[PDB]
Design a protein around this nucleic acid. Structure first.
Lengths: 95, 82, 96, 104, 81, 97, 102, 93
DNA sequence: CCGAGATCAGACGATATCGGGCACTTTCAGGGTGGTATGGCCGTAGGCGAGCACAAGGCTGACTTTTCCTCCCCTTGTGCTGCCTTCTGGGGGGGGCCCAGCTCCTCCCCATGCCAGGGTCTTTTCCCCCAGGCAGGAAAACAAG
DNA sequence: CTTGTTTTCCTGCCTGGGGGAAAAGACCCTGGCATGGGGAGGAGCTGGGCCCCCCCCAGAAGGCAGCACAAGGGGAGGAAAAGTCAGCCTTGTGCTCGCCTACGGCCATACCACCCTGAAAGTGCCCGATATCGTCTGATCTCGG
């Protein structure tokens, strides 16, 4: 038995809107954060609370961006979001 | 820890964020755009955080420094001090 | 050695929590967020009143500046009720 | 007696006086400056705690958490406006599904 | 003092649209923009009037307008600072 | 002789983007401002510089809104801006959430 | 005077008194007004160079709000810095979408 | 009778030093006054908050350095701190 | 690709309102002295951040299938644009006036600096009560028939 | 629409771990004393925003022809979605080193308060001159055939 394409997407949406966990993996997120900070200042140290704060800010920003891009894609009479939708969303909000 | 770390927010993770964002169908070109968006945002915030740290005559990027950096960009973060 | 003691709004947050809903607990992070909330609104209204006074050229920040800063920084219903409660509290402070 | 007890405020009126003085917000700080402002902070905290406890009870939980806090903030229209550019840590997102992306 | 909003005529909204790079305009754009301008003016007038009442003045001044629009992020140059 | 539909619109776009006048009528914009301030307070006064400030800001605000609604219209496989385009622009900018 | 000694054109004394009487902090340093005056002088000169260049390109010898607004909205860094200021009497930059272009 | 202080005498002179050929209209000059009365208020205030965060009560020139480094884009910062520090050194030496 | 038609651009006569210069004053930066107090430097401990094995199992990468979506083309019809004409109010001028905004003097009432002492605020222990795991049961959609 | 098939919420049971109460320190809150300074109130002036009247002409308003683009329908293809399998690396546990942030102490020099002084900006008035109005041509883009 195979589910109709789409219903597991809706199940994922519901399951992932009912939860308050964090979706990116901590170790690669921390590695990326340290790499980014390396350019600003070589050989820095990073508090665990600081890196967790960065994750909980970045993921929320991404969620908001995805919601607005979904609104754009729906406006374009679609269900699929696209880089065009992402670009329009950013260019309108001012980023 | 020095190179090729942007490929750590994997396609399943971006899919998780998007499904939290209400997206049902996701184009295959969305992942490499969301990665870049996150990279630019993190640059925007970590620059200010590192500037706060280096001004404070310190060496450890602190939670208060990160919160200040987010506060300047209109990204007030609740829970980590203030 | 002794370390410099930290300071917070936690006792007053606990009292207001036990006054509004005396049956539901609160987490450590649900305490940090509320501390951030109270101090952020404190800073916002203080800055608004400061700029108001400096524009009006009044050297002392008073209930007038605080009330108008609340009216300018909070959206309608929150501003109205915050102004009302602040006024009723300042009346008691003036009297008692 | 103490200023907080005088007006019934649960808030440190004297500490708010200190913060106003040392905050460099004005060369002089009035005596209504901390009573009024502590009343404002106390009322706003009372409202957000009320709605957050309601959100907690909606999930059969007796421990208020960031989830319930942000549920209250993003469900009440007015407080979302007040805290629009504010990010709550580990709170989730509001559950929304657009009408177009639904089974027919 | 009634329905001054209609004073913003269809030609004027078309002028603004052509300034904004609009090539073709529907028939409901005019009423939508009338509502939008009414809301924005309500916000800015609220802030400026509150400034004036704090100053206890009876006139609305350019400096009050600049401050009210600065507090909303729409900082206004040229007319004081 | 008549012009094709659109060639007048583009010329009006260029002629106005090259210009800098206040595109709305001053006297009834001022009357609109007075009517709006009426509910906030009775018998208000208005400095001429203040009302000119308000108009010079509102015009720029509407022009920005009309270059964002235009981008929405171009996004939705169209050349005509629509009320739905206005609503999408305002939702994504953050005026009504 | 301090302005003559340091070569600064903007009023070092005036900015020092503005810093001191504006209730920013208890004390104000002695390199603070030099630094702030230099910053404002350079930034206003940066705006003026572009504004004058724009005026010259149109064979006009009088700077106007339209010219300054054009300079702001055209220069990339200055556009980011003054990203949300509504310059009175500025208009907008000529820019038409290609899809509406024939 | 009352008098008003502005930045006009200085703005006109820096104009006559950078572009010594053309002048300023009244409205443009008011624009410039509002601009240099806006960046000033940004930098002084944000340096004040830097001093508040570092638990100080003195706006040293290092606060203004950091304030420029935070409120300006990249090249704007590189070209503003340069002038600030150069002027600071000239002031004593 | 051909010619008519409407539109946009330059430029010289001319003009007046506006930008620049001159003289006074009038406020306000600046020099000198005294003094402290916030801050810079040295000492020291300590607590938390960096580097490191060890699984293991949930999670990620990858290949198949199909299925429902995206995208291009046809067509219509319908509201949108372009042009002409009526007439109407925006705009410029001219004057009056009336209340409202800015100044200045007084002096007093509330805000400011300091004393001492305790009462509220802060850090440490502890436990039990509420969050958490988890296996089984019933309810719930789902999709091929 | 019946019925098989996965998914999801519920619940009883036990566990665990960290929040709410108790214990003592600590550090600055409130009353009280002496004070000086900014604002509340009350003339005084004066100045500009409200109000009206009048004339003109340019722009809104309404309609009519006609037209080209928004929207619905059709159809092919192709690329996400759901499913399954192998491998891998996140992380929860437990550990070691060390070094960087902070608290304390000492003093030190540079910025605050306070008096004179002259000097640079704010004010008002006058001179010239520069962007602008008008109209004649010249250049340019547009549209039917």
């Amino acid at each position: 038995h195979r589910y109709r394409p789409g219903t597991v997407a809706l199940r994922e949406i519901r399951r992932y809107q009912k939860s308050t966990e964090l979706l990116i993996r901590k170790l690669p997120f921390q590695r990326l954060v340290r790499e980014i900070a390396q350019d600003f200042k070589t050989d820095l140290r990073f508090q665990s609370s600081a890196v967790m704060a960065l994750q909980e800010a970045s993921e929320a920003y991404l969620v908001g961006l995805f919601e607005d891009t979904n609104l754009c894609a729906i406006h374009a009479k679609r269900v699929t979001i696209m880089p065009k939708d992402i670009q329009l969303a950013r260019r309108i909000r001012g980023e | 820890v020095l190179r090729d770390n942007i490929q750590g927010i994997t396609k399943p993770a971006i899919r998780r964020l998007a499904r939290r964002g209400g997206v049902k169908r996701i184009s295959g070109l969305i992942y490499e755009e969301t990665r870049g968006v996150l990279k630019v945002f993190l640059e925007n915030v970590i620059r200010d955080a590192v500037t706060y740290t280096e001004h404070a005559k310190r060496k450890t990027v602190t939670a208060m420094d990160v919160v200040y950096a987010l506060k300047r960009q209109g990204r007030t973060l609740y829970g980590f001090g203030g | 050695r002794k370390r410099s003691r930290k300071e917070s709004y936690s006792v007053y947050v606990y009292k207001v929590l036990k006054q509004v809903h005396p049956d539901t607990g609160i987490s450590s992070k649900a305490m940090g967020i509320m501390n951030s909330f109270v101090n952020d609104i404190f800073e916002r209204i203080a800055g608004e009143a400061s700029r108001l006074a400096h524009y009006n050229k009044r050297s002392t920040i008073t209930s007038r500046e605080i009330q108008t800063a609340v009216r300018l920084l909070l959206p309608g219903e929150l501003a109205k009720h915050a102004v009302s409660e602040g006024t009723k509290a300042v009346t008691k402070y003036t009297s008692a | 007696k103490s200023r907080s007890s005088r007006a019934g405020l649960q808030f440190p009126v004297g500490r708010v006086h200190r913060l106003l003085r040392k905050g460099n917000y004005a060369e002089r700080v009035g005596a209504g400056a901390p009573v009024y402002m502590a009343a404002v902070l106390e009322y706003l905290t009372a409202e957000i705690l009320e709605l957050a406890g309601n959100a907690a009870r909606d999930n059969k939980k007796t421990r208020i958490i960031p989830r319930h806090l942000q549920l209250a903030i993003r469900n009440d229209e007015e407080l979302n406006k007040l805290l629009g550019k504010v990010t709550i840590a580990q709170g989730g997102v509001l559950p929304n599904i657009q009408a177009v992306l639904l089974p027919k």
